[PDB]
Write an enzyme that holds these catalytic residues in place. Sequence first.
Site, mmCIF file in Angstrom:
data_model
loop_
_atom_site.group_PDB
_atom_site.id
_atom_site.type_symbol
_atom_site.label_atom_id
_atom_site.label_comp_id
_atom_site.label_asym_id
_atom_site.label_seq_id
_atom_site.Cartn_x
_atom_site.Cartn_y
_atom_site.Cartn_z
ATOM 1 N N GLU A 104 0.834 -1.191 0.000
ATOM 2 C CA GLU A 104 0.000 0.000 0.000
ATOM 3 C C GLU A 104 0.878 1.253 0.000
ATOM 4 O O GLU A 104 0.607 2.212 -0.725
ATOM 5 C CB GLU A 104 -0.904 0.012 1.231
ATOM 6 N N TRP A 168 0.227 -7.536 6.161
ATOM 7 C CA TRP A 168 -1.141 -7.683 6.646
ATOM 8 C C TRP A 168 -2.049 -6.858 5.729
ATOM 9 O O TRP A 168 -2.347 -5.697 6.024
ATOM 10 C CB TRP A 168 -1.256 -7.185 8.081
ATOM 11 N N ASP A 170 -5.117 -5.098 3.610
ATOM 12 C CA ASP A 170 -6.298 -4.402 4.092
ATOM 13 C C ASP A 170 -7.557 -5.228 3.940
ATOM 14 O O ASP A 170 -7.615 -6.181 3.160
ATOM 15 C CB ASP A 170 -6.468 -3.063 3.368
ATOM 16 N N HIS A 216 -2.033 2.806 13.847
ATOM 17 C CA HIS A 216 -2.786 3.143 12.648
ATOM 18 C C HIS A 216 -2.422 2.193 11.515
ATOM 19 O O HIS A 216 -1.342 1.580 11.510
ATOM 20 C CB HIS A 216 -2.579 4.620 12.243
ATOM 21 N N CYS A 217 -3.377 2.026 10.602
ATOM 22 C CA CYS A 217 -3.226 1.187 9.417
ATOM 23 C C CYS A 217 -3.367 2.159 8.258
ATOM 24 O O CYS A 217 -2.516 3.034 8.089
ATOM 25 C CB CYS A 217 -4.313 0.101 9.359
ATOM 26 N N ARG A 223 -7.872 -2.778 10.600
ATOM 27 C CA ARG A 223 -6.739 -3.434 11.226
ATOM 28 C C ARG A 223 -6.348 -2.810 12.565
ATOM 29 O O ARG A 223 -5.935 -3.508 13.488
ATOM 30 C CB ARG A 223 -5.552 -3.424 10.264
ATOM 31 N N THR A 224 -6.476 -1.496 12.675
ATOM 32 C CA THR A 224 -6.137 -0.800 13.913
ATOM 33 C C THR A 224 -7.068 -1.220 15.042
ATOM 34 O O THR A 224 -6.649 -1.357 16.185
ATOM 35 C CB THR A 224 -6.252 0.728 13.739
#
Lengths: 282, 6, 4
Positions: A104, A168, A170, A216-217, A223-224
């Site tokens: 990302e 990981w 999204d 944070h993601c 995820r957060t």
Amino acid sequence: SPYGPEARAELSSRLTTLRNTLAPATNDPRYLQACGGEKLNRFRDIQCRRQTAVRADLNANYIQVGNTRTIACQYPLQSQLESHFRMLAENRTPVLAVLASSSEIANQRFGMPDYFRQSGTYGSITVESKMTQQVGLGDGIMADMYTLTIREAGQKTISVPVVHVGNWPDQTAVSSEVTKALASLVDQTAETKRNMYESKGSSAVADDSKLRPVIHCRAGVGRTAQLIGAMCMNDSRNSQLSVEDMVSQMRVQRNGIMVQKDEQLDVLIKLAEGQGRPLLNS
Amino acid sequence: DADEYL
Amino acid sequence: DEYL
């Protein structure tokens, strides 16, 4: 069964209702509004609660579920980095967990600057990055750790421990085993660093708004949320805090989107079951 | 001083 | 943009 289909269906029902009520209305008095011509939200549907916002120019919130205090935020925009770094410094951040994948960050269209894996200058702030250890979390998932040194003439230099999970993706949820290991590493990291400020008699140990782990993601809601929910269950002071309590508190303190995918809430449900923690209230 | 937290 |  306290974790049977009937219970799971009830919990979702309550959560669904809440998410709809917290839906951001045009110019909602409950959410932070962009003052001027500067973009605040990374997404027009992922907003920041006003009464728990850290700064007026960042999409971040102070979150406390039970006795666990953290800070959830969206992946900083290019133009928010300077303000983002001051927030980390001021907060005397014991640990920064970044759950956004490397893929990302690399995607130039996603507008996610790689501000922690490389050194650089942002306005008045100077940041130095250095890679430390790598911890295996299971299922091939790895945690890459760094150390960020924030320098700003006139301010005290602050170094922040960084835990980055690059694999990981999204809108997905890692196993509960992994999540449990990742929650442990973050607490240990935070615990070690926090100990340092206490041995130095820091003035942040007395401030409940500081010394909070920042997580944070990308949007800071999927995820957060999974990690935060897992961190609460790690805290030995959150006895009797239900799964309903956790998600509720997260949504009311940030936005009704906290814990996006059902697959994510399932991991939390699984961890709670392993602890005999209640899903519903009353 | 400036770096007493490093 | 929309995160959906």
